[PDB]
């Protein structure tokens, strides 16, 4: 039995083989993207990259319980292949999330400038957890116009007030190496509940564990890098 | 003989077989999305929708010249499959364009609210036309620890696009595509013309066009607008 709530210094396949099947409620995975940003992100070909990816995906799917949720980050191009692969495995597509980075980067002169990233969101069944009221976003200028057209329409004889926490979150996200904590927070608030178990087999700086712990979720995870693991476990403990 | 610069009332498969191979520089295609918005947009299965889609794609690819470009709109989910199909046909991926509609109309309570649309942009070779200076957009400025003045012509356009509002595509969006990926006098193809947006913008930009739609009312009205 693998110790929960501590990041382990393990290869993802070794780690995954130690995880109990059907024990995980949410898996949030930011894996290699094949962009050659490091030795672990360099592959000989696109097929080798996909074979590696599909191998870890298969194991992660065995870990999810019957209604579990899955989020996988990658470039849009790699997500096209991963999306079709997940459909072929029986997973249920929920959303193609677009992270609009709006950074200063991506400049190109043979094509539009890059930088967006994709998050695929699938679930094991149609009875997954989706806490929509916990991830609402601030109302726009245009939501307020709609609010004005409905203000005079009474409900049950009285004025109706729209939710004070904002509008339902959509699929194109914009925020203020590690993923932004607010981004991972939206994922964990929407697709898990307090005390559920969250898995991340490429922990990196430990963002998934850190945010899971702050939100009262349990986590299980690993990274092959000793320095990253020790540094993240230290952050978790204070 | 197939008339150039006219929208034809034809089925897309018959129309494409009349178009000469290797004659087109840019194809801008907004096809069925399988969202059941009409009889032509309703398929019995996803597999049937993909078989139909690959059939018209194969013919479109034959119409592009050796360095031609292709834009195909669809939902993100269907573009995942179309993207992989285009890669298997030897086309070169350039961008996964995200159209963020900023549509205030959310009501999903089982997943995030929908509305985004994707435009896949591929080329036949690495020597395609890409007029990056014709599609710059609006942004001293902090960048890398330094302070800079913006390029006065605007910044290079990226891949997540915001353009307000069958539902005809926004003329400004289609204009960005035709300015980026074609030149004056090139030929633009669209085999699912609908209201005629691709033809109208192409004509306003000094490009030639050819296209079709099976709907007689759409073709006549579009041809009306083009003639005026
Ligand atoms: C893109 S990063 C994760 C970043 C993380 N989301 C965070 O916010 O910092 C992927 C991580 O995968 C780890 N890694 C790469 N290949 C691995 C493998 N086969 N097994 C385990 N860890 C691996 C790397 O050491 C790196 O820290
Ligand atoms: C999404 S709409 C095109 C909208 C267009 N981009 C516009 O801006 O108005 C798809 C169009 O496909 C046409 N259509 C559907 N199936 C067709 C087929 N097999 N052959 C030809 N036209 C077809 C429909 O009549 C409809 O006008
Ligand atoms: Na779907
Ligand atoms: Na690529």
From Swiss-Prot, chain A:
Specify the superkingdom: Bacteria
Q: Which reaction does this enzyme catalyse, per its entry?
A: a 2'-deoxyadenosine in DNA + S-adenosyl-L-methionine = an N(6)-methyl-2'-deoxyadenosine in DNA + S-adenosyl-L-homocysteine + H(+)
Gene3D superfamilies the UniProt entry points to: Vaccinia Virus protein VP39
- Keywords noted in UniProt: DNA-binding, Methyltransferase, Restriction system, S-adenosyl-L-methionine, Transferase
Q: What is its EC number?
A: 2.1.1.72
Its GO CC terms are: cytoplasm
Record's subunit section: At low concentration exists as a monomer and homodimer. Probably binds to DNA as a monomer.
| Biological role | It is not known if the cytosine of the complementary sequence TCTTC is also methylated by this enzyme.
Protein name per Swiss-Prot or TrEMBL: Type II methyltransferase M1.MboII
Protein source organism: Moraxella bovis
User: Gene of origin?
Assistant: mboIIM
